[PDB]
Design a protein around this ligand. Structure first.
Ligand SMILES: [Mg+2]
Ligand SMILES: [Mg+2]
Ligand SMILES: [Mg+2]
Ligand SMILES: [Mg+2]
Ligand SMILES: [Mg+2]
Ligand SMILES: [Mg+2]
Ligand SMILES: [Mg+2]
Ligand SMILES: [Mg+2]
Ligand SMILES: [Mg+2]
Ligand SMILES: [Mg+2]
Ligand SMILES: [Mg+2]
Ligand SMILES: [Mg+2]
Ligand SMILES: [Mg+2]
Ligand SMILES: [Mg+2]
Ligand SMILES: [Mg+2]
Ligand SMILES: [Mg+2]
Ligand SMILES: [Mg+2]
Ligand SMILES: [Mg+2]
Ligand SMILES: [Mg+2]
Ligand SMILES: [Mg+2]
Ligand SMILES: [Mg+2]
Ligand SMILES: [Mg+2]
Ligand SMILES: [Mg+2]
Ligand SMILES: [Mg+2]
Ligand SMILES: [Mg+2]
Ligand SMILES: [Mg+2]
Ligand SMILES: [Mg+2]
Ligand SMILES: [Mg+2]
Ligand SMILES: [Mg+2]
Ligand SMILES: [Mg+2]
Ligand SMILES: [Mg+2]
Ligand SMILES: [Mg+2]
Ligand SMILES: [Mg+2]
Ligand SMILES: [Mg+2]
Ligand SMILES: [Mg+2]
Ligand SMILES: [Mg+2]
Ligand SMILES: [Mg+2]
Ligand SMILES: [Mg+2]
Ligand SMILES: [Mg+2]
Ligand SMILES: [Mg+2]
Ligand SMILES: [Mg+2]
Ligand SMILES: [Mg+2]
Ligand SMILES: [Mg+2]
Ligand SMILES: [Mg+2]
Ligand SMILES: [Mg+2]
Ligand SMILES: [Mg+2]
Ligand SMILES: [Mg+2]
Ligand SMILES: [Mg+2]
Ligand SMILES: [Mg+2]
Ligand SMILES: [Mg+2]
Ligand SMILES: [Mg+2]
Lengths: 48, 122, 32, 131
RNA sequence: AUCAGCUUGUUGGUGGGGUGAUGGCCUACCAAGGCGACGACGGGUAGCCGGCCUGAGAGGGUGACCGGCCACACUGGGACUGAGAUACGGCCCAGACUCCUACGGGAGGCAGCAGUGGGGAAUAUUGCACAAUGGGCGCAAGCCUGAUGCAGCGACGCCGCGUGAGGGAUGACGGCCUUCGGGUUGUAAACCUCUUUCAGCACAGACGAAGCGCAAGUGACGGUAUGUGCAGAAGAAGGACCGGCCAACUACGUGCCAGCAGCCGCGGUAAUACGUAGGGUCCGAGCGUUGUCCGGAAUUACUGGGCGUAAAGAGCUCGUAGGUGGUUUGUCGCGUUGUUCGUGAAAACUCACAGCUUAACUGUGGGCGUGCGGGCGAUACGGGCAGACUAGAGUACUGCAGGGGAGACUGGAAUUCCUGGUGUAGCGGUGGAAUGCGCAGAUAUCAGGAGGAACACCGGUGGCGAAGGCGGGUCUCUGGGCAGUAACUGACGCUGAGGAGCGAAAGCGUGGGGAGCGAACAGGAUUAGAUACCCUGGUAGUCCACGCCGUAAACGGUGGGUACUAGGUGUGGGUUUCCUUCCUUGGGAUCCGUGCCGUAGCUAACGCAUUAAGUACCCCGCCUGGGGAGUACGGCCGCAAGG
RNA sequence: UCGAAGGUGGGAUCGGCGAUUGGGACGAAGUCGUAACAAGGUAGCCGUACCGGAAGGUGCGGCUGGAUC
RNA sequence: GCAUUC
């Protein structure tokens, strides 16, 4: 019954490279764009 | 232990030692007996205990007790072996069924007959 | 607790060390 | 360090109740204040007040002992605790001493007792049992 | 993890190819990525589920039938046809096996139904129908259907019913006990009447078909089920158990034998436990035994356990991931909570109701389906986000105690040796002796010299250090702690899987040193022996330099942090108020150590008890009957010992 | 081009047997001592080292889970 | 001082 925190890596498509390492971003599911990739970058929400 | 420890490792149940392994999960196993011989019980008890060395269809050699007061068995006899621990004997885990295959039911039985393979008298 | 418990372990350990003494050279030659 | 102020509050209460102390002083918190309010309304304590200390407010809880020095609190148990937090649906609300005690349930409607929560049909976090 | 790294079409991009469709699916080039202690890559095992069994529940075990998915069709590979292909009764190739041959070459595939051999403790008929329901083709009549509906066989399971009912005596015979009175079997039996359920022998005889064909015939089961007559208690009871658990006791027969047994345990010429008999008990067309799973087992403990001495706190720290988080304002609505909608197939389960003569069984309608997804509501609590605060934590400043550590130099007592006096014949050693040292000048005594190691008194159940540990003096370098003041920062905290560091003594490597002590090793003594204890000697070692090793009853046999819960009394280090001499162990208060004694509470007891083993919260380590065994194997570390 | 089966090669890994050899458990009334439990007749035990038919002895450091005073 | 065993 303890609340357990778990982390999942995801591969997302962004055309322009607008989100760098360490930034906080929003994603949406999409069709398969390649093996693995099933997410697209919607908006880079808070850069750091 | 703390909940975190339980979440990390968990509880591990005691592993169950598989009993009566030579039956291979069967209720009984057929076997051919190599030797018939009497054996001494453990120190407080004293008797001559009738025992057979049985090669099972499971391809395991086993010692089996012969229940009843009198037996017909000798080398190459075909017997049916069931589970059964005889406390007195050190290594004996299986008993031979009386009344099955080559083993005759014990003579002059009148009570507990079904456990000794004797027909009802007419 | 009783020293009996320690004495049981003592014996087993001592016999093992003595076994290791007697087989030392054998273990080297057979481990090569 | 200090890790559960509410458990500390309950144990200060429990230990003073065992020692037959008339008063208990605590570091004030708004959550402790609301719990003390519930204990007053349910009759387990006599009164409480908020005083000032050097650096913050202090909660003073006055314990209730009947004639022939008989404790009004029979037991006090911290139920939800850091990490292992306990939540109850309105239909699964816990009963304390078959209903003769009180469970303190934190709800979006505020702190309530199992009785109130069940009437209002709300669930929440089960903070403590009192009996 | 006794499986720590794996991956190069592999991870991503662009241009082509390919497909019904997206996509390294394929391909060429370009970038160097991707997955892993939230166990990658390996190894072992296994079809999954609705459900089933067990269980108070949580959980545990399991996946037979029935129902849904998946996978395969002698073994391996491949495609073709088609709306659709693991193509079981298709095709092509290769292999194994069986068969035919004219020797050139051919032909097979029951994990469909039935059946055979084989393996095994063990699992059925080489039935009858397409009448009903579902399916294929046909406009349709119809044809096909080992799907299916039924029948056969096996107490294999569940449920129902029968094997008789009423009466019948101071209570027969016979059996078995006995206090020789009798007592049990036992109302039992015999006998006297009463009803024929189920079986038996006759005579009627279906529903399943608002079907099908509309040509008018058509039910496999089946002359079955079920009704109505006839005869007569007539044909129909067994199995286990009876020492305690656990319901039910006596006699005889063998006497530690023959045997019994789930456990404890019963048999040694008087057994309620062995065997038989009488009696009894529990179940009944079944009763027992073996195997298997759950329960009892709170005995892996989430519900629901522990670690001073019973099994269990890492030798001690530091710290990585992780877990956890003081007070307060606003906000999000992720966790949590309310509500509504969708879904959670049927069966099963459960409540109700109905149908089979009842039941099992079957059907209908609710619930169940704990879940998940969408919309909308709440914001106490957890969390995210943006702030504030000083009580936790850390810093600064002023004082203070200390064998805390490291380096260098240095002091005296004593032992030993050496040199030289004086001086002799003993010394030395033990429970008592002897080896031994002397008489070649010992021991003893005096003076001088050398050299090594340990630091008497101070010195304590006292101080310091994380633990191991630390005591002659001085100097140099250096770590920690405590109090006072709140000057400063503003939760920066706690713990810590792995990991790293420190870690008594012994031991190991190289180079020094070696007075005393002293494993091994010699003698002497003791003794039955004496590989010992005692004596005389004595080598490694003990010491230093620099490494290694990584164990101890490394102990408080008690992990770390924090808060709270009667007191009394010692002692170590600070602060302060009063009494005043201002004598000061005068006394109080307060903070931080270290002891003893004692409440409450806890504990199996012993005991612990504000320095908890009490009342609670956070994190780690560890336990799960005794032996085998902290052993083997594998691996890592080490020069070795070994850890 | 890809490609089943087949061939060759050097390794992985899981087992079976093996002259000989190590310890472990159990067994009746065998042999040798007497190490531990009382101060067990030298207090016992822990780590380590060397030694001895065997238990075990001794050194160094540690513990009380040690009697008497 | 010495004193093994059942
Ligand atoms: Mg393309
Ligand atoms: Mg399989
Ligand atoms: Mg249970
Ligand atoms: Mg096609
Ligand atoms: Mg076929
Ligand atoms: Mg076909
Ligand atoms: Mg078949
Ligand atoms: Mg067979
Ligand atoms: Mg049809
Ligand atoms: Mg028609
Ligand atoms: Mg046909
Ligand atoms: Mg009884
Ligand atoms: Mg359980
Ligand atoms: Mg069991
Ligand atoms: Mg326990
Ligand atoms: Mg503890
Ligand atoms: Mg212990
Ligand atoms: Mg410790
Ligand atoms: Mg951290
Ligand atoms: Mg908080
Ligand atoms: Mg956090
Ligand atoms: Mg359903
Ligand atoms: Mg030095
Ligand atoms: Mg001289
Ligand atoms: Mg002299
Ligand atoms: Mg740490
Ligand atoms: Mg660790
Ligand atoms: Mg040393
Ligand atoms: Mg050496
Ligand atoms: Mg050395
Ligand atoms: Mg040297
Ligand atoms: Mg000596
Ligand atoms: Mg080191
Ligand atoms: Mg250790
Ligand atoms: Mg120590
Ligand atoms: Mg320890
Ligand atoms: Mg603690
Ligand atoms: Mg104190
Ligand atoms: Mg006390
Ligand atoms: Mg305890
Ligand atoms: Mg062991
Ligand atoms: Mg080892
Ligand atoms: Mg090894
Ligand atoms: Mg061999
Ligand atoms: Mg002795
Ligand atoms: Mg002794
Ligand atoms: Mg002696
Ligand atoms: Mg002793
Ligand atoms: Mg010696
Ligand atoms: Mg010593
Ligand atoms: Mg003897």
């Amino acid at each position: 019954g303890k609340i357990i925190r778990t982390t999942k890596k995801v591969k997302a498509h962004d055309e322009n490279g607008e989100a760098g390492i360490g930034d906080r971003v929003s994603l949406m599911e999409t069709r398969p764009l390649s093996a693995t990739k099933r997410w697209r970058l919607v908006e880079i929400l808070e850069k750091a | 232990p703390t909940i975190q420890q339980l979440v990390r490792k968990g509880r591990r149940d005691k592993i169950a030692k598989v009993k009566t392994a030579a039956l291979k999960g069967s209720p009984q196993r057929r076997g051919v007996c190599t030797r018939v011989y009497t054996t001494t019980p453990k120190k407080p008890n004293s008797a001559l205990r009738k025992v057979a060395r049985v090669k099972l269809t499971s391809q395991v050699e086993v010692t089996a007790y012969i229940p009843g007061e009198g037996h017909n068995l000798q080398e190459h006899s075909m017997v049916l072996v069931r589970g059964g621990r005889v406390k007195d004997l050190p290594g004996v885990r299986y008993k031979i069924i009386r009344g099955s295959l080559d083993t005759q039911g014990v003579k002059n039985r009148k009570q507990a007959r079904s456990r000794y393979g004797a027909k009802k008298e007419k | 607790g009783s020293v009996i418990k320690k004495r049981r372990k003592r014996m087993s350990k001592k016999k093992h060390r003595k076994l290791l003494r007697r087989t030392r050279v054998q273990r080297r030659k057979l481990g090569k | 360090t200090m890790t559960d102020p509410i458990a500390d509050f309950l144990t200060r209460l429990r230990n003073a109740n065992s020692a037959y102390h008339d008063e208990v002083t605590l570091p004030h918190s708004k959550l402790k204040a609301n719990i003390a309010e519930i204990l007053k309304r349910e009759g387990y304590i006599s009164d409480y007040r908020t005083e000032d200390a050097r650096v913050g407010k202090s909660l003073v809880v006055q314990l209730k002992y009947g004639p022939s020095r008989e404790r009004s609190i029979a037991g006090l148990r911290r139920v939800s605790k850091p990490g292992l937090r306990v939540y109850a649906k309105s239909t699964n609300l816990p009963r304390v001493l078959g209903g003769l005690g009180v469970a303190i349930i934190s709800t979006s409607s505020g702190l309530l007792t199992d009785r109130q929560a069940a009437r209002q049909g709300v669930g929440g976090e089960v903070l403590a049992y009192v009996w």
